[PDB]
Amino acid sequence: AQTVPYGIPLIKADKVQAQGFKGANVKVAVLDTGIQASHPDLNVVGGASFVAGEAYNTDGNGHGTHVAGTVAALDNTTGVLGVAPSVSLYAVKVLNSSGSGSYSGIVSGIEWATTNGMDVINMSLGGASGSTAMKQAVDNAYARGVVVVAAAGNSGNSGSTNTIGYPAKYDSVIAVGAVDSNSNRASFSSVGAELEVMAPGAGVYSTYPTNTYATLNGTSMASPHVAGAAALILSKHPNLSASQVRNRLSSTATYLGSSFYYGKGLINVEAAAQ
Numbered sequence: 001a002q003t004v005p006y007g008i009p010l011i012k013a014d015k016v017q018a019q020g021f022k023g024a025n026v027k028v029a030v031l032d033t034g035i036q037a038s039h040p041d042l043n044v045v046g047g048a049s050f051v052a053g054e055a056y057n058t059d060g061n062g063h064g065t066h067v068a069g070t071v072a073a074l075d076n077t078t079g080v081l082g083v084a085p086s087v088s089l090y091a092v093k094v095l096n097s098s099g100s101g102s103y104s105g106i107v108s109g110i111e112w113a114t115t116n117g118m119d120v121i122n123m124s125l126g127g128a129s130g131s132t133a134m135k136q137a138v139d140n141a142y143a144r145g146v147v148v149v150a151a152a153g154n155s156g157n158s159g160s161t162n163t164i165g166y167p168a169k170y171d172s173v174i175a176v177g178a179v180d181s182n183s184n185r186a187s188f189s190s191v192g193a194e195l196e197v198m199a200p201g202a203g204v205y206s207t208y209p210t211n212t213y214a215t216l217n218g219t220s221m222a223s224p225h226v227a228g229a230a231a232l233i234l235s236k237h238p239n240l241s242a243s244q245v246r247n248r249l250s251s252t253a254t255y256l257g258s259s260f261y262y263g264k265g266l267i268n269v270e271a272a273a274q
């Protein structure tokens, strides 16, 4: 009855969960297209919507619900299993139905998160340009102690060209690229100097509106695996700073090749949370 998506054991989230660490008391904000709150495999504790006309607890696109599922689908007897199934989950709607958002809408969500005390923020979204307000938002969240994770971008490679989008590109943000179930880099994952770590991003099965489950591909899919890992580490070592959590993830990652296409490699939560 409950499926375990390959990504979970691929990053060894399962071993950690077997230790009794599932993210309980860790608050994660999913900055996305909203979350279908009524899905039986998800427990949304609160949120906000910065998109006109849509409440934070519906998802007319599906993207947000899928991403939240990877972080926290409930550990039960149905559907799927999140990386950190006991986290307190907040849906912060910054992208519209069509999956796109404004800088000031994004910026408001990041501030909301900061203000409301989230421990980790996930942003499976990215644009070619950043903005000063956006950079300020992320630098302050991180300086305040929140772990900020964003998808690197689905731009691929070209010659020696950085294809990493914003906000993943800022240095207070962890840029995550995508591997497939064979741990190989997926063709669509952006490349560049800023790429930091890789996680499962191809063929990822998660929660999906209405009350179902679907497979999607994307750096968007990889990101929540890292947000979820951070949450696991915190559940295990609540004492750590954001930068400490960050550093554990990159330092213990499994090496796969050059950092321009792989960052430091694929995350290993079990080694990270030692």
Ligand SMILES: [Ca+2]
Pocket (backbone or CB within 6 Å): 037, 038, 039, 040, 041, 042, 043, 044
């Ligand atoms: Ca529900």
Ligand SMILES: [Ca+2]
Pocket (backbone or CB within 6 Å): 002, 041, 073, 074, 075, 076, 077, 078, 079, 080, 081
């Ligand atoms: Ca489940």
Ligand code: NA
Pocket (backbone or CB within 6 Å): 167, 168, 169, 170, 171, 172, 173, 174, 175, 194
């Ligand atoms: Na970055």
